Amino acid sequence: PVFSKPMDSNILKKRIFAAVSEGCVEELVELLVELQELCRRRFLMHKLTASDTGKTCLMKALLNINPNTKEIVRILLAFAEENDILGRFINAEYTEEAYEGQTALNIAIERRQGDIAALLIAAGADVNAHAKGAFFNPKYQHEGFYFGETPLALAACTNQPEIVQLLMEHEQTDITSRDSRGNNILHALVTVAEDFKTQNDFVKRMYDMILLRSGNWELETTRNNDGLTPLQLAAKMGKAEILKYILSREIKEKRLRSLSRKFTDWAYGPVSSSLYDLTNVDTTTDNSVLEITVYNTNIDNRHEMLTLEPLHTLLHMKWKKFAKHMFFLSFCFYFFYNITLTLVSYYRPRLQLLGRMFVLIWAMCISVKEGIAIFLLRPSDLQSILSDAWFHFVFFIQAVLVILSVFLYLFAYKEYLACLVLAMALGWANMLYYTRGFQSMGMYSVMIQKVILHDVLKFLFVYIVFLLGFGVALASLIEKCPKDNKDCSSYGSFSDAVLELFKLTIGLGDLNIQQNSKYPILFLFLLITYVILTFVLLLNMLIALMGETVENVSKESERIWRLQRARTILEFEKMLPEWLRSRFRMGELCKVAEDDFRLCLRINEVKWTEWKTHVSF
Amino acid sequence: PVFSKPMDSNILKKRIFAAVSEGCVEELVELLVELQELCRRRFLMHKLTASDTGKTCLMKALLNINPNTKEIVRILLAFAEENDILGRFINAEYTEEAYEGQTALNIAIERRQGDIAALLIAAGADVNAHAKGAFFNPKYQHEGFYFGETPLALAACTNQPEIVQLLMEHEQTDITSRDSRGNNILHALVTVAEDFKTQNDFVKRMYDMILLRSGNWELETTRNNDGLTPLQLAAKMGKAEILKYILSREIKEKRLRSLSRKFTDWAYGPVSSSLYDLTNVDTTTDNSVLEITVYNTNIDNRHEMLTLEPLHTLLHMKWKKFAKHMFFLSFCFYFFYNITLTLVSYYRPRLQLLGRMFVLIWAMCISVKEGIAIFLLRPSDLQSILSDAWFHFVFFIQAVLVILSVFLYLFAYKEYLACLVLAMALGWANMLYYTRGFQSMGMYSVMIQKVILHDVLKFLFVYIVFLLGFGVALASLIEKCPKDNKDCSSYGSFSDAVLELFKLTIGLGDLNIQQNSKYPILFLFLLITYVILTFVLLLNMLIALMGETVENVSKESERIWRLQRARTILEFEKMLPEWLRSRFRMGELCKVAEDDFRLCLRINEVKWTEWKTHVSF
Ligand SMILES: CC(C)C/C=C(\C=O)C(C)C
Ligand SMILES: CC(C)C/C=C(\C=O)C(C)C
Ligand SMILES: CC(C)C/C=C(\C=O)C(C)C
Ligand SMILES: CC(C)C/C=C(\C=O)C(C)C
């Protein structure tokens, strides 16, 4: 965080700023009387405002607060009344690029002072004046303080509800005012919340106050500049507490029940048949909160908010309804394609040609989907943890290897086997993708990907360094055995010596010690020290590396597997044509409203743990 | 949980239901006067009751409670007094299949209201009216709310004891009333309890109140529809707190001491000689709580309630008395059978025939017990965790292989060795069953079964996929070496290539790189990538998989072993003939009662930790 200029720096007009900084009033009141007539003996009181910055004495007084500050603000404003410049004095604007648009009301609200803040507003302060500075609108979280760039949202982003209540009651205040980010009062509150459960979080408590007092459906429907309602913004930023509050918001009182996203129908002991609203949760529209929350648009907090009631059962009625019947079909139609690819080519000649045609019409079928899936892929997802993109190359590669091989079959480049037989080894290793449909083995394949990434690549990369150095060092010592024979040359070339070192790691071959080295002692010293760096230092410790991996993750392995399946639930859903997606939850109900455009959903909740505890008191 | 119709849906007779729903009375009292004479100008007031459902205004008023509801129920009943239809109005019944039999008293009791509930009962409410609906009687735990289908048990299943106390004092209330499940007031309380220790659990507190006020032995002896006393039902559902309370129930006061299952004889400091009752705990009868609690009829909570005092020492005096003397005999008589099977057949000819006869008369002896044990087995136990059934096939298979082999011995099909020599390898691996009699190694064999199931099968299943794909891929590249010789063909067929890959995993053989591949580079690329998927990715990680297994279980391995032994304690007991089971605990004592049919048991309890803490205050 680097800012070119500071807001307040306590390092003949300087007497104005010095007097208000230390809070001294006696040196100011008599001296302010003197200033009254400098302009007369000379309409535009420049002298009491700074030049390089727009900061005035009013901003200077409030930025350097003290118990004497209240005694200064009242007389400072009275000076502008005599010169009739209170309009320009109160609405004075900062001019630095970092802090631009900050007014005296903005600083008074920040410094936890409802006394002067009410006084300035009553004096004609510019309510809903936007602080459109680079500092107030940081490019990241740590580059500044973003709060919505309005005095109302600043009091809302801070924990001062009294100044909020005063600002709501003001007539000139524009509630549905959008700042330079296209945000709102509710968008700003969503950004400043946190996903970590805090005992005393005012954001969801103040979300209720601002929304209810507005009492209409325009704050929750106003779109962002990127294009995002306050509902969807909480999903993009991963705000679970706000998402749980918004999706399950029930208003008991009349005249405001239209602001409810969940209308409980009936309750009887543990079971209650709540009737939720999903007018912006189902994937019928674009950028749904369900679609946003399952992809890697949220960070480090997905399952704790993918289990929320309106959308936890949205996936179950998508899996148990059409996704399960298409995972088997994808499993069967790929198992048969792999079996046919193996069968018709293991029996290759050194009428079953209709089976070979099936591989032709299906390798193109896989690659046309993978080819179009690569285009929708982005580098922001290609290298990540929950990418689900590595399976998009290897499905494409195994498909593109088959069609490339057969193009060289009839054309007879003799390389038709160099590409086809690599598809068998990859095609059968691709069969492990379709094990997500089982909990016991789907969690197992989750462990494999974490093991193959955190530990195996780190072991191999060190290993080739010990294989390149020791391969060259061992092969360099060996002269050419006489008689021009291939004997004496187990370590004769770099490729021959590296291969013999690799066979030493697994445990295959004979460890000869008289391999025609011109230093027999040095060759053995370099041999009985290679196996203590790999077999004793690395291979045993490789087993040790993965123990930290399978102990920290095993309590989250069942959590990551569900997110894999929940992604394929809607990845399958987008493949259905528009006429096929005519099967949805339920019709329009829950309210007369605007002629009932409320796509509701009835899910009964039988909760035994809470009800048992509730009656226990 | 899916219900076709809702109980209460707040989405010219509709004015009746609307007025009571919102609690408005002014719009009802004058309008109810109007209704009085619609039927006259027209015995059967249909108009104020619903048609598709039996719900009336009384049910509608109580389902939509409000502070004005008490002001509505009193005048609503007075309307039926004038028409003299209070009998049909109060006893009005629901008619939906989901919710059937629900009355106005049932809803009033549910909504924590003892005021109206007492008023309805005083008005002639149908006490002990059964709500025999599909919702009130769910097929599972999450399909509804089961509470015993009576107003008394509903107040008991909820935490309202005042309405219970009122219902006990009523004359018309039938305490020993059985619902559609054959349950009782005490059966229903057992079902709604929980095995997790809760600080404030009313169920065992309300079990005391209902049983004592009844003051007789008919609630604890009334059989279920499945056939189960309230004692045995707590064992089937795994209710440890109720089981600990019931089995150790001591009533101090006279006239009710006959309702005690434990009569403490004397106490002196730490040692107290409690004298328990096991009239339904010992295995003398069928479906004993001891027999039920040791088999896999309880779930996830067995050792925390198999250690309860009446039945923790019931097994110790069965092990130290006849079970230990039959485990050695089973160990010796099977060790000798295995030794004889090995000895008389390792020396097979390429008079000791009496030893061969012993295997004949004992292989049939094993298979006749295993054959009859398979019939008593069920698929509900065949595939489980604490099955103790896998040892029933392999004991049967090893027994059936011996008799099958000798049938081909004299008959001379020459296959007599193909079945007999497989019995040695299985017969000696069966010798590890009889290691349950030792703590150090019995816990070891518990680890093996968990390791062999959670980890080894998951590793092998992935391994054959990498062996099928790489076996075909390696064998496909190899042409037939000239001269029609068997050289050049280490990977010549599928079986030859798969075998050479398996030997690569363990570490046997020579890793040749010039194995007559028509692509020497591609064969090596497919070879130095198979060993990084098994030897580097799988075999090392296999060791890693079992580390989560031996760290989470080792604190429970000593717990599962006891349940294995406790099952064989009564598995041995059922083998004794009726005359042999003439040795039991102790006679009839502890009370005069009904001519003393109380099979008691005296077990002295020397408790030093509690007594030391008790005197410390
Ligand atoms: C390209 C062939 C060598 C198969 C490659 C793999 C599968 O075995 C990788 C993905 C592990
Ligand atoms: C043997 C390979 C194919 C396993 C590696 C993966 C597949 O599961 C990726 C996803 C890490
Ligand atoms: C049938 C023979 C091969 C013995 C089989 C086993 C014992 O070694 C299995 C039970 C592990
Ligand atoms: C070598 C085998 C016989 C071990 C496996 C078992 C026996 O202990 C079953 C019970 C898992």
UniProtKB/Swiss-Prot annotation, chains A, B:
- How does the UniProt record describe the way this protein sits in the membrane? Multi-pass membrane protein
Q: Source gene?
A: TRPV3
Q: Name one Pfam family in it.
A: Ank_2
Which PANTHER family does the record cross-reference, listed alphabetically? TRANSIENT RECEPTOR POTENTIAL CATION CHANNEL SUBFAMILY V MEMBER 3, TRANSIENT RECEPTOR POTENTIAL ION CHANNEL PROTEIN
- Name the family: Belongs to the transient receptor (TC 1.A.4) family. TrpV subfamily. TRPV3 sub-subfamily.
Record field: intramembrane? 490-515
Its job: Non-selective calcium permeant cation channel. It is activated by innocuous (warm) temperatures and shows an increased response at noxious temperatures greater than 39 degrees Celsius. Activation exhibits an outward rectification. The channel pore can dilate to provide permeability to larger cations. May associate with TRPV1 and may modulate its activity. Is a negative regulator of hair growth and cycling: TRPV3-coupled signaling suppresses keratinocyte proliferation in hair follicles and induces apoptosis and premature hair follicle regression (catagen).
Gene Ontology biological process terms, A to Z:
actin filament organization; calcium ion import across plasma membrane; calcium ion transmembrane transport; negative regulation of hair cycle; osmosensory signaling pathway; positive regulation of calcium ion import; response to temperature stimulus
A GO cellular-component term linked to this record: cilium
Residues in compartment: Cytoplasmic: 1-316, 378-388, 436-438
**Family annotation (CDD domains):** TRPV3 (cd22194)
Select a single GO molecular function from the record's annotations and give it: calcium channel activity
What does the tissue specificity note say?
Abundantly expressed in CNS. Widely expressed at low levels. Detected in dorsal root ganglion (at protein level). Expressed in the keratinocyte layers of the outer root sheath and, to lesser extent, to the matrix of the hair follicles (at protein level).
Q: Which domain of life is it from?
A: Eukaryota
Protein name per Swiss-Prot or TrEMBL? Transient receptor potential cation channel subfamily V member 3
Return the SUPFAM superfamilies for the record.
Ankyrin repeat
The regions listed as transmembrane in this protein's record are 317-346, 351-377, 389-409, 415-435, 439-477, 519-555
